Amino acid sequence: MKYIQTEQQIEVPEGVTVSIKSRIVKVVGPRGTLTKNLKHIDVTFTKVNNQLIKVAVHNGGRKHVAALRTVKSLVDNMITGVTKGYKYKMRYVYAHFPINVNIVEKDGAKFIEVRNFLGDKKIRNVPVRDGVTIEFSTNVKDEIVLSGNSVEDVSQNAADLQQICRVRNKDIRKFLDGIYVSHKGFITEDL
Amino acid sequence: IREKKAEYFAKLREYLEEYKSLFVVGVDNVSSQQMHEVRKELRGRAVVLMGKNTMVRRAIRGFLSDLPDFEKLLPFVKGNVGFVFTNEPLTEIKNVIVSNRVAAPARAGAVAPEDIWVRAVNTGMEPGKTSFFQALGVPTKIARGTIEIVSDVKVVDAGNKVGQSEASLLNLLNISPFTFGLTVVQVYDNGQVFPSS
Amino acid sequence: IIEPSLKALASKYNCDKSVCRKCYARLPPRATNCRKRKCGHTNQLRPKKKLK
Amino acid sequence: NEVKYLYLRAVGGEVGASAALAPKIGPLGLSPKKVGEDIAKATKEFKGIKVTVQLKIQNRQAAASVVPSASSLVITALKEPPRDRKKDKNVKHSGNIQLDEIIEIARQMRDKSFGRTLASVTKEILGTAQSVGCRVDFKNPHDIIEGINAGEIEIPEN
RNA sequence: UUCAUCUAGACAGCCGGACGGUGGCCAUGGAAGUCGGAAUCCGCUAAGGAGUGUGUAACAACUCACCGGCCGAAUGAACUA
Ligand SMILES: [Mg+2]
Ligand SMILES: [Zn+2]
């Protein structure tokens, strides 16, 4: 159909500055700086009133106008990451063998170590992506918490931790052992 | 559809200008059963029209043409509000409406309003039922051939929803940590709305 | 044993899924079409069989 | 005191099921066959028809005195000889109920019946009659429901 | 293409309710809405099916049709090539 104009709004809170060169977005907020390259989407950014950015697609097809809302969501998540942050809480689930999760250093790289998963003698190592902070949560049993500006990096770290603990050669409906994302929210409460 | 809506609006008209003392009551969290009970109590005293905010609002705005007195009602038509029309004594009708406060039991995954505790008393349920206490880590022992909680234990706490097991044991031992009932917020009467009482 | 809440959490990822009848792909529980190209994105999906 | 309000569903004029009464009442010091006997004697009005007996557990006392249940009452008002499932089960229950009997049932239930008027109580009684697929004064329950809400056979609501 | 819903608030989304008569009747050792046959009813009703599923040995219990609270403009279904 080639819709003439499609537009999306990106609200910018007070403490956030968005610098948009051709398609390189730099969002700066209280929690830090996030950067994203969007030169693969062919959209147009325009600053309206220093609190609102419009992103537009001109003469766009269905896939193009869907990518427009995808871009709006990506930039909104960048702004959310620099204002509130992103935190994923994962639970260790096991029937018999307690999963031992720790933080170790290998040439200054901050791996997450998983031992005794389903009794395996193998040691699973998941590198911590830069910008992601790991905290083992008290007051809740067997909880790991991943916090950071980029929801992409936080969720990818959580996904790596979850996928490294997949059960092989067993009925996974019965062997539910693993490390599963239990909650996805923001670092700052109720913001 | 439009036919039924027009019928509803006509019923609204007659209810309004025959039963001036209507009660804007809050049906939020009120069960259908409790509604039926309170209605049966007020039978022959108070009719309870309980349509959707939007249609009631539009209808009363239209009726303003002949009965402008009801404009103040419109800003109050928000949330789950039901108009209990009547003319019988205000105090008595309101008391019957807002006196039944049924103890709502622990439905699964229901937000806990307080720090509900389970008490070191002889519950009396059959030995078999000890499984729930075991699952919830409730310290108990069979006394007089029945389950008896040895020590006080907080089962649920403020915040976290009441998980299926939590709710199951709570319902089993009859702790009902909720309370639902017809809650009047305002009362229009003799062409005047005012605080619920 | 696994406590009910953690068991339900694990089941959300292991058991509460759809399966394509043509290509057996593990699909989201609310999916209407398969995501795989081999099966032609068919709408022939079933719930993943529950243990016991 | 012991005011336990526990009850069951033993068939009319029938011994309360031994299997049912082994884990429920038997524990509460009440012989299952004794419960069956008292249930039968109470349910003589409900002969052959399942009806809750509202056995009031008042300090080791089986309280056979039945609570009339609308559907069971309709099956009784059928006035068909007590259902003899022993001779050919899948018994036929049509039992033309003169509407007077339905009104009597409604009078006996109004106390509890949510039915706002004596009309409404009779109305739901006849709905249960249609559920049991009987006939009332040689006319389909649904159609006499139409007539009773239309204004020919009215009900003297108290 | 055709038929539908919709500013007298469309669909989706989050939360509340989802009763009473009623374990409706029957086949079954037991089957209460939900392994099965028939009957496809109403009172309260904005609304509730003698029942959309999960679950029970049967219960009980969650679940959905149905109606609501919030947001506010287009949306849904079956088809054609
Ligand atoms: Mg094997
Ligand atoms: Zn497939």
XYZ file of C-alpha atoms (C1' of nucleotides) and ligand atoms in Angstrom:
681
model
C 0.000 0.000 0.000
C 2.975 2.349 0.585
C 1.566 4.585 3.306
C 2.594 8.185 2.657
C 3.752 8.939 6.203
C 4.010 6.876 9.372
C 5.185 8.427 12.617
C 6.079 7.417 16.159
C 6.792 9.475 19.268
C 9.695 9.085 21.698
C 9.183 10.905 24.997
C 12.439 12.155 26.542
C 12.408 12.701 30.334
C 14.089 15.727 31.892
C 17.500 14.243 32.683
C 18.012 12.629 29.266
C 19.706 14.069 26.185
C 19.428 12.248 22.852
C 22.087 13.025 20.239
C 21.018 11.663 16.853
C 23.480 11.984 14.001
C 22.534 10.291 10.728
C 21.330 7.110 12.393
C 23.705 6.858 15.373
C 21.751 7.453 18.590
C 23.526 8.435 21.818
C 21.182 8.568 24.811
C 22.672 10.090 27.974
C 20.925 9.967 31.330
C 21.584 9.737 35.068
C 22.656 6.081 34.836
C 25.102 6.525 31.950
C 25.363 6.535 28.153
C 23.848 4.106 25.644
C 24.681 4.058 21.934
C 22.905 2.366 19.032
C 23.445 2.171 15.272
C 20.193 2.249 13.270
C 21.605 2.762 9.757
C 19.873 -0.480 8.674
C 16.267 0.759 8.921
C 16.074 3.936 6.784
C 14.028 6.094 9.161
C 14.034 9.850 9.799
C 14.481 11.429 13.233
C 13.318 14.937 14.130
C 13.482 16.781 17.450
C 10.237 18.618 18.194
C 10.357 20.344 21.585
C 13.435 18.962 23.447
C 11.126 16.473 25.205
C 9.789 14.702 22.099
C 11.512 12.998 19.170
C 9.449 12.014 16.148
C 10.628 9.089 14.035
C 9.069 8.828 10.595
C 8.931 6.555 7.566
C 7.925 8.134 4.250
C 6.307 6.062 1.478
C 6.863 2.899 3.503
C 5.591 -0.628 3.043
C 4.242 -2.922 5.734
C 7.633 -4.258 6.837
C 9.107 -0.743 6.825
C 6.342 0.678 9.013
C 6.714 -2.293 11.374
C 10.437 -1.564 11.645
C 9.440 2.023 12.461
C 7.684 0.941 15.656
C 10.609 -1.400 16.322
C 12.950 1.620 16.179
C 10.690 3.593 18.505
C 10.704 0.703 20.986
C 14.499 0.380 20.784
C 15.067 4.076 21.501
C 12.467 3.994 24.283
C 14.319 1.059 25.849
C 17.567 3.035 25.570
C 15.978 5.950 27.436
C 14.512 3.576 30.028
C 17.940 2.018 30.489
C 19.606 5.353 31.145
C 16.839 6.531 33.508
C 15.620 3.495 35.473
C 17.987 0.725 34.411
C 17.076 -2.876 33.678
C 17.248 -5.786 36.108
C 16.477 -9.452 35.460
C 15.995 -11.811 38.404
C 16.542 -15.509 37.677
C 15.763 -18.441 39.971
C 17.763 -21.641 40.279
C 15.371 -24.592 39.969
C 16.453 -28.107 40.900
C 14.936 -31.283 42.314
C 17.959 -33.000 43.894
C 21.288 -31.386 42.981
C 21.775 -27.825 44.298
C 23.043 -25.520 41.565
C 26.165 -23.670 42.725
C 26.421 -20.268 41.017
C 29.372 -17.964 41.695
C 31.358 -15.135 40.111
C 34.954 -15.951 39.164
C 37.729 -14.113 37.346
C 39.705 -15.498 34.395
C 42.253 -12.915 33.214
C 39.886 -10.211 34.462
C 36.784 -11.329 32.565
C 34.102 -11.959 35.254
C 32.638 -15.328 34.374
C 29.593 -16.816 36.081
C 30.366 -20.345 37.269
C 27.654 -23.012 37.438
C 28.661 -26.207 39.238
C 26.760 -29.359 40.225
C 23.981 -28.672 37.702
C 22.068 -31.979 37.703
C 25.192 -33.393 39.336
C 27.359 -32.698 36.285
C 31.104 -32.717 36.858
C 31.391 -30.192 34.026
C 31.719 -26.549 35.076
C 29.660 -24.087 33.042
C 31.113 -20.615 32.476
C 29.051 -17.679 31.204
C 31.048 -14.471 30.587
C 29.522 -11.298 32.006
C 28.966 -8.764 29.244
C 30.431 -5.338 29.937
C 27.964 -3.046 31.674
C 26.097 -5.944 33.323
C 26.429 -6.293 37.104
C 25.734 -9.612 38.845
C 24.349 -9.726 42.383
C 23.346 -12.875 44.249
C 20.202 -11.824 46.054
C 19.757 -12.313 49.773
C 16.317 -12.694 51.411
C 15.346 -14.919 48.458
C 16.628 -18.460 47.995
C 18.678 -19.184 44.857
C 18.280 -15.859 43.030
C 20.746 -14.186 40.683
C 20.127 -10.597 39.573
C 21.545 -8.964 36.440
C 21.450 -5.166 36.305
C 22.542 -2.691 33.665
C 21.679 0.123 31.311
C 21.122 -1.935 28.158
C 18.133 -4.273 28.308
C 19.718 -6.032 25.331
C 22.909 -6.900 27.215
C 21.066 -7.707 30.458
C 18.576 -10.021 28.747
C 21.296 -11.622 26.615
C 23.354 -12.367 29.734
C 20.273 -13.850 31.404
C 19.571 -15.883 28.259
C 23.142 -17.199 28.141
C 22.847 -18.262 31.781
C 19.510 -19.956 31.062
C 20.698 -21.739 27.908
C 23.949 -23.016 29.430
C 21.743 -24.956 31.892
C 19.623 -26.891 29.390
C 18.913 -30.533 30.215
C 20.125 -33.094 27.668
C 18.941 -36.655 26.999
C 16.125 -36.347 29.555
C 12.410 -35.580 29.622
C 12.648 -31.848 30.322
C 9.024 -31.882 31.491
C 10.244 -33.975 34.451
C 13.838 -32.708 34.747
C 12.931 -29.050 35.204
C 16.399 -28.197 36.544
C 17.875 -24.956 35.272
C 18.308 -21.233 35.834
C 15.219 -19.407 34.589
C 14.384 -15.717 34.291
C 11.730 -15.135 36.948
C 11.311 -11.356 36.724
C 12.218 -8.601 34.263
C 11.898 -5.001 35.432
C 13.827 -1.854 36.258
C 16.636 -1.153 38.713
C 14.911 1.903 40.184
C 11.731 1.045 42.067
C 8.330 2.199 40.768
C 9.782 4.830 38.428
C -28.584 -3.996 20.618
C -29.759 -0.399 20.335
C -33.236 -1.692 21.221
C -31.959 -3.178 24.489
C -29.988 0.000 25.220
C -33.117 2.122 24.715
C -35.071 -0.208 27.017
C -32.331 0.163 29.637
C -32.454 3.952 29.289
C -36.247 3.990 29.698
C -35.869 1.874 32.838
C -33.227 4.360 33.996
C -35.661 7.248 33.438
C -38.460 5.640 35.443
C -36.068 4.527 38.202
C -34.650 8.050 38.507
C -37.916 9.973 38.547
C -39.715 7.532 40.762
C -36.960 6.469 43.219
C -35.009 9.700 43.819
C -32.946 8.308 46.721
C -30.414 6.334 44.713
C -27.137 5.045 46.157
C -23.947 5.156 44.082
C -22.472 1.944 45.505
C -19.112 0.373 44.744
C -19.377 -3.153 43.341
C -15.589 -3.414 42.953
C -14.526 -6.848 44.284
C -18.149 -7.645 45.207
C -19.115 -11.140 44.097
C -22.253 -11.885 42.105
C -23.463 -14.063 44.988
C -23.090 -11.226 47.509
C -24.881 -8.920 45.068
C -27.786 -11.370 44.836
C -27.911 -11.678 48.634
C -28.016 -7.923 49.292
C -30.604 -7.547 46.515
C -32.771 -10.238 48.123
C -32.464 -8.376 51.428
C -33.526 -5.054 49.874
C -36.263 -6.766 47.824
C -39.363 -4.589 47.680
C -37.317 -1.703 49.108
C -34.452 -0.808 46.741
C -34.021 -1.672 43.072
C -30.391 -2.023 41.960
C -29.582 -0.848 38.434
C -26.014 -1.674 37.722
C -25.167 -0.896 34.081
C -21.916 0.295 32.512
C -20.516 3.709 33.443
C -20.470 4.810 29.815
C -24.121 4.107 28.924
C -25.383 5.409 32.267
C -23.401 8.618 31.743
C -24.701 9.185 28.208
C -28.268 8.369 29.281
C -28.256 10.798 32.212
C -26.661 13.518 30.064
C -29.527 13.052 27.616
C -32.093 13.091 30.433
C -30.625 16.407 31.638
C -32.909 18.068 29.054
C -35.934 17.531 31.313
C -34.066 16.684 34.557
C -30.897 18.816 34.747
C -30.685 18.101 38.506
C -28.726 14.909 37.771
C -25.650 16.552 36.193
C -23.653 16.273 39.442
C -24.163 12.497 39.265
C -22.165 12.306 36.013
C -18.680 13.136 37.431
C -19.284 10.436 40.063
C -19.992 7.698 37.480
C -16.525 6.150 37.445
C -15.306 2.737 38.490
C -17.665 -0.146 39.195
C -20.594 1.916 40.485
C -24.183 0.684 40.732
C -27.225 2.906 41.282
C -29.445 1.455 44.031
C -32.628 3.449 43.473
C -35.239 3.644 46.235
C -37.443 5.987 48.246
C -37.607 4.129 51.584
C -35.688 5.593 54.580
C -32.161 6.613 53.604
C -30.506 5.392 56.805
C -32.139 1.946 56.810
C -31.513 1.296 53.106
C -27.877 2.417 53.340
C -27.328 0.320 56.473
C -28.647 -2.789 54.736
C -26.496 -2.032 51.675
C -23.199 -1.424 53.488
C -23.698 -3.692 56.528
C -23.154 -7.072 54.850
C -19.355 -7.458 54.712
C -18.764 -11.069 53.687
C -15.396 -12.500 54.728
C -13.795 -13.264 51.383
C -11.465 -16.290 51.658
C -7.950 -16.641 50.251
C -8.320 -17.124 46.521
C -5.129 -18.250 44.804
C -2.691 -15.484 43.904
C -4.611 -12.766 45.762
C -2.591 -9.740 46.897
C -2.039 -9.982 50.647
C -3.309 -6.859 52.472
C -1.521 -7.636 55.760
C 0.902 -9.994 57.524
C -1.481 -12.918 57.936
C -0.349 -15.411 60.583
C -1.349 -18.997 61.351
C -1.946 -19.767 64.994
C -0.624 -22.430 67.373
C -4.077 -23.875 68.047
C -5.559 -27.334 67.530
C -6.909 -27.001 63.989
C -8.849 -30.266 64.245
C -8.639 -31.408 60.619
C -8.000 -35.028 59.687
C -4.398 -36.372 59.908
C -4.285 -36.682 56.118
C -4.560 -32.897 55.721
C -1.120 -32.523 57.363
C 0.370 -32.528 53.836
C -0.509 -28.855 53.288
C 1.193 -27.822 56.538
C 4.240 -29.901 55.579
C 4.408 -28.230 52.159
C 4.128 -24.775 53.735
C 6.662 -25.740 56.417
C 4.122 -25.224 59.198
C 5.472 -26.820 62.417
C 2.689 -29.127 63.544
C 2.022 -32.342 65.446
C -0.975 -34.642 65.774
C -2.795 -33.843 69.021
C -6.042 -35.547 70.105
C -5.831 -37.428 66.806
C -5.851 -34.170 64.827
C -3.399 -31.676 63.354
C -2.220 -29.059 65.861
C 0.147 -26.224 64.959
C 2.846 -26.241 67.628
C 4.058 -22.666 67.064
C 2.820 -19.433 65.494
C 4.017 -18.984 61.902
C 3.509 -16.211 59.360
C 2.174 -17.946 56.240
C 1.784 -15.014 53.844
C 3.095 -11.463 54.110
C 2.148 -8.029 52.799
C 2.832 -7.705 49.092
C 3.401 -11.159 47.572
C 0.266 -12.790 46.179
C -1.127 -15.805 48.028
C 0.297 -18.746 46.058
C -1.952 -21.728 45.289
C -0.594 -23.778 48.215
C -0.834 -20.792 50.584
C -4.457 -20.148 49.594
C -5.317 -23.853 49.795
C -4.087 -24.184 53.380
C -5.635 -20.838 54.383
C -9.031 -21.934 53.051
C -8.607 -25.354 54.675
C -8.020 -23.874 58.136
C -10.712 -21.207 57.513
C -8.534 -18.082 57.657
C -10.284 -15.728 55.212
C -7.981 -12.672 54.916
C -10.255 -10.615 52.675
C -13.532 -8.760 53.133
C -15.911 -7.887 50.293
C -19.152 -5.945 50.477
C -21.402 -3.369 48.863
C -19.633 -0.042 49.546
C -21.649 3.122 48.938
C -19.383 6.023 47.968
C -22.022 8.760 47.502
C -25.804 9.049 47.840
C -28.007 11.204 45.629
C -31.253 12.102 47.381
C -34.098 14.652 47.075
C -32.247 16.099 44.106
C -28.903 16.290 45.918
C -25.825 14.080 46.060
C -23.721 14.043 49.238
C -21.214 11.880 51.216
C -22.186 8.197 51.397
C -23.674 8.341 54.909
C 11.259 -32.029 44.975
C 10.548 -28.626 43.405
C 8.361 -26.053 45.128
C 5.216 -25.238 43.104
C 6.248 -21.683 42.174
C 9.689 -22.626 40.846
C 8.201 -25.690 39.146
C 5.672 -23.466 37.368
C 8.485 -21.089 36.396
C 10.485 -23.940 34.853
C 7.345 -25.309 33.187
C 6.675 -21.924 31.574
C 9.831 -22.545 29.512
C 9.839 -26.356 29.259
C 6.198 -27.498 29.014
C 3.838 -24.551 28.345
C 4.603 -24.533 24.626
C 3.077 -25.380 21.268
C 4.345 -28.028 18.850
C 3.990 -27.893 15.075
C 2.224 -30.998 13.787
C 4.338 -30.992 10.606
C 7.848 -30.137 11.866
C 7.644 -30.667 15.674
C 9.007 -27.173 16.380
C 8.669 -25.926 19.960
C 6.412 -22.893 19.572
C 5.035 -20.204 21.888
C 1.922 -21.395 23.742
C -0.280 -18.745 22.085
C 1.240 -19.045 18.600
C -1.129 -19.364 15.643
C 1.454 -20.205 12.953
C 4.742 -22.074 13.005
C 7.828 -19.900 12.603
C 9.717 -22.492 10.534
C 9.973 -22.116 6.764
C 10.222 -25.883 6.196
C 6.612 -26.440 7.297
C 5.346 -23.389 5.407
C 4.377 -21.507 8.591
C 1.458 -23.882 9.049
C -1.413 -23.258 11.449
C -1.492 -26.988 12.314
C -0.278 -26.687 15.902
C -1.010 -28.682 19.049
C -0.225 -28.118 22.726
C 2.925 -29.789 23.984
C 1.899 -32.952 25.814
C 1.938 -32.477 29.580
C 3.869 -34.928 31.731
C 1.642 -37.413 33.581
C -20.729 -27.491 71.540
C -20.879 -29.665 68.395
C -22.893 -27.973 65.629
C -21.128 -29.545 62.609
C -23.200 -28.788 59.499
C -22.092 -31.734 57.351
C -24.513 -33.541 55.035
C -24.711 -35.782 51.953
C -26.861 -36.954 49.065
C -28.185 -40.454 49.836
C -30.935 -41.584 47.472
C -34.529 -41.287 48.666
C -35.723 -44.041 50.981
C -32.360 -45.736 50.486
C -29.460 -46.769 52.702
C -26.734 -44.121 52.556
C -23.905 -45.636 50.511
C -21.555 -47.621 52.739
C -18.583 -46.605 50.581
C -19.582 -42.931 50.769
C -20.203 -43.085 54.531
C -17.007 -44.965 55.422
C -14.605 -41.954 55.210
C -17.039 -39.069 55.904
C -19.569 -39.853 58.666
C -18.266 -43.186 59.946
C -15.302 -41.298 61.428
C -17.755 -39.008 63.260
C -19.112 -41.951 65.257
C -22.225 -42.662 63.154
C -22.921 -46.124 61.707
C -23.360 -45.859 57.903
C -26.351 -48.209 57.880
C -27.934 -46.305 60.780
C -27.531 -43.099 58.760
C -29.104 -44.937 55.839
C -32.086 -46.006 57.949
C -32.815 -42.538 59.324
C -32.236 -40.996 55.881
C -34.748 -43.452 54.396
C -37.376 -42.694 57.041
C -36.958 -38.943 56.500
C -36.895 -39.272 52.691
C -40.131 -41.284 52.544
C -41.444 -38.024 51.065
C -38.635 -38.317 48.472
C -38.944 -42.077 47.919
C -36.408 -43.228 45.341
C -35.088 -39.714 44.612
C -31.699 -38.390 45.734
C -32.110 -35.478 48.149
C -29.751 -33.783 50.594
C -30.852 -34.766 54.102
C -29.067 -31.940 55.987
C -27.873 -34.302 58.709
C -27.230 -31.905 61.598
C -24.370 -33.246 63.719
C -25.556 -32.063 67.149
C -23.369 -33.805 69.744
C -23.399 -37.324 68.268
C -26.873 -37.125 66.730
C -27.636 -38.059 63.148
C -30.388 -35.579 62.236
C -32.305 -37.254 59.427
C -34.730 -34.335 58.988
C -34.419 -33.623 55.283
C -33.956 -30.292 53.541
C -36.370 -30.262 50.567
C -34.445 -29.751 47.319
C -36.472 -28.304 44.426
C -35.502 -30.868 41.774
C -36.052 -33.851 44.079
C -39.381 -32.334 45.137
C -40.397 -32.105 41.473
C -39.530 -35.779 40.959
C -41.677 -36.616 43.995
C -44.554 -34.424 42.770
C -44.444 -36.533 39.613
C -46.328 -38.911 42.016
C -45.000 -41.834 39.962
C -44.631 -44.981 42.132
C -41.247 -44.856 43.923
C -38.690 -45.384 41.160
C -37.989 -49.116 40.971
C -34.585 -49.090 39.308
C -34.235 -52.675 40.590
C -36.661 -54.040 37.969
C -35.774 -51.973 34.894
C -33.341 -49.098 35.343
C -33.643 -46.231 32.921
C -37.070 -45.703 34.488
C -39.423 -43.258 32.753
C -40.194 -40.166 34.856
C -42.883 -37.982 33.297
C -45.424 -37.918 36.119
C -47.825 -35.166 35.037
C -47.775 -32.624 37.873
C -50.975 -30.666 38.386
C -49.659 -27.121 38.759
C -51.216 -26.955 42.237
C -48.461 -29.340 43.362
C -45.761 -27.137 41.810
C -47.192 -24.130 43.656
C -47.147 -26.186 46.864
C -43.472 -26.984 46.269
C -42.760 -23.293 45.698
C -44.572 -22.425 48.932
C -42.397 -25.004 50.697
C -39.200 -23.498 49.185
C -39.898 -19.734 49.156
C -38.203 -19.366 52.560
C -34.814 -20.201 51.022
C -35.610 -19.770 47.311
C -33.956 -16.682 45.852
C -37.130 -16.201 43.781
C -38.266 -12.657 44.511
C -41.991 -13.315 44.242
C -44.024 -16.456 44.725
C -44.259 -16.193 40.993
C -40.496 -16.325 40.638
C -40.167 -19.268 43.009
C -42.835 -21.211 41.082
C -41.075 -20.217 37.842
C -37.749 -21.773 38.832
C -39.540 -24.823 40.240
C -41.019 -25.330 36.760
C -37.579 -24.748 35.256
C -36.365 -27.668 37.353
C -39.417 -29.571 36.116
C -38.271 -28.951 32.534
C -34.783 -30.048 33.593
C -36.291 -33.363 34.711
C -38.212 -33.274 31.433
C -41.630 -33.844 32.980
C -44.995 -32.342 32.033
C -47.277 -30.098 34.083
C -51.074 -29.997 33.555
C -50.570 -31.523 30.094
C -48.299 -28.743 28.858
C -44.581 -28.216 28.300
C -42.913 -26.590 31.367
C -41.425 -23.932 29.083
C -44.799 -22.967 27.599
C -46.580 -22.825 30.936
C -43.583 -20.696 31.996
C -44.534 -18.399 29.149
C -48.173 -18.324 30.310
C -47.331 -17.683 33.970
C -45.052 -14.778 32.956
C -47.669 -13.611 30.403
C -50.616 -13.251 32.779
C -53.100 -16.147 32.677
C -52.098 -18.542 35.493
C -50.894 -16.163 38.200
C -49.452 -16.934 41.632
C -50.785 -15.477 44.940
C -47.518 -14.031 46.232
C -47.678 -13.354 49.963
C -15.845 -10.370 -2.116
C -19.489 -10.866 1.500
C -21.186 -10.505 6.317
C -20.405 -8.409 11.054
C -18.684 -4.923 15.814
C -17.832 0.332 16.746
C -17.388 7.550 20.347
C -24.977 5.229 22.949
C -16.723 3.230 23.578
C -14.973 -1.689 18.250
C -10.714 -5.682 19.089
C -6.469 -6.377 21.953
C -4.229 -5.511 26.970
C -4.233 -5.469 32.954
C -7.694 -6.402 37.232
C -13.224 -7.827 39.493
C -17.275 -11.055 39.192
C -18.553 -15.522 36.795
C -24.314 -16.972 41.149
C -29.243 -19.466 42.790
C -32.923 -23.100 41.545
C -28.870 -27.252 41.028
C -25.367 -33.055 42.792
C -31.194 -30.888 36.837
C -32.611 -36.099 34.736
C -30.550 -40.673 33.198
C -26.740 -44.870 32.057
C -22.197 -46.116 36.476
C -19.057 -49.448 41.618
C -18.565 -43.849 41.914
C -19.844 -39.123 37.058
C -22.118 -33.118 41.153
C -21.469 -28.490 34.043
C -17.243 -30.864 32.060
C -15.558 -40.242 29.962
C -21.128 -40.785 28.091
C -27.504 -40.099 26.203
C -31.553 -36.697 26.312
C -33.471 -32.100 27.949
C -30.763 -26.929 25.618
C -35.052 -23.740 31.170
C -35.172 -19.597 33.772
C -34.901 -15.873 39.045
C -30.947 -12.334 40.179
C -30.011 -10.179 36.316
C -24.628 -5.287 33.144
C -23.954 -11.329 33.271
C -23.449 -16.392 33.746
C -23.460 -22.318 29.499
C -27.401 -27.604 33.256
C -21.592 -25.624 30.469
C -15.059 -23.586 27.174
C -11.020 -26.236 29.371
C -7.503 -27.706 33.629
C -7.968 -30.507 37.735
C -11.051 -34.917 41.495
C -11.558 -42.005 42.482
C -16.355 -38.639 43.031
C -15.660 -33.861 45.608
C -13.894 -29.517 46.398
C -10.877 -25.969 43.425
C -8.832 -22.811 39.372
C -10.650 -21.558 33.632
C -13.430 -19.695 29.736
C -17.985 -18.280 27.379
C -21.060 -13.610 29.620
C -20.810 -8.829 32.022
C -17.841 -5.243 34.029
C -13.126 -1.148 35.827
C -9.090 1.540 32.969
C -7.129 3.442 27.759
C -9.509 5.732 23.603
C -10.699 4.635 16.790
C -11.204 1.772 13.900
C -11.726 -3.547 14.299
C -13.283 -8.850 13.352
C -14.760 -13.386 10.450
C -15.230 -16.371 6.268
C -13.791 -16.327 1.604
C -11.447 -14.999 -3.683
C -6.680 -14.926 -6.604
Mg 15.865 -41.945 28.041
Zn 6.353 -26.160 11.714
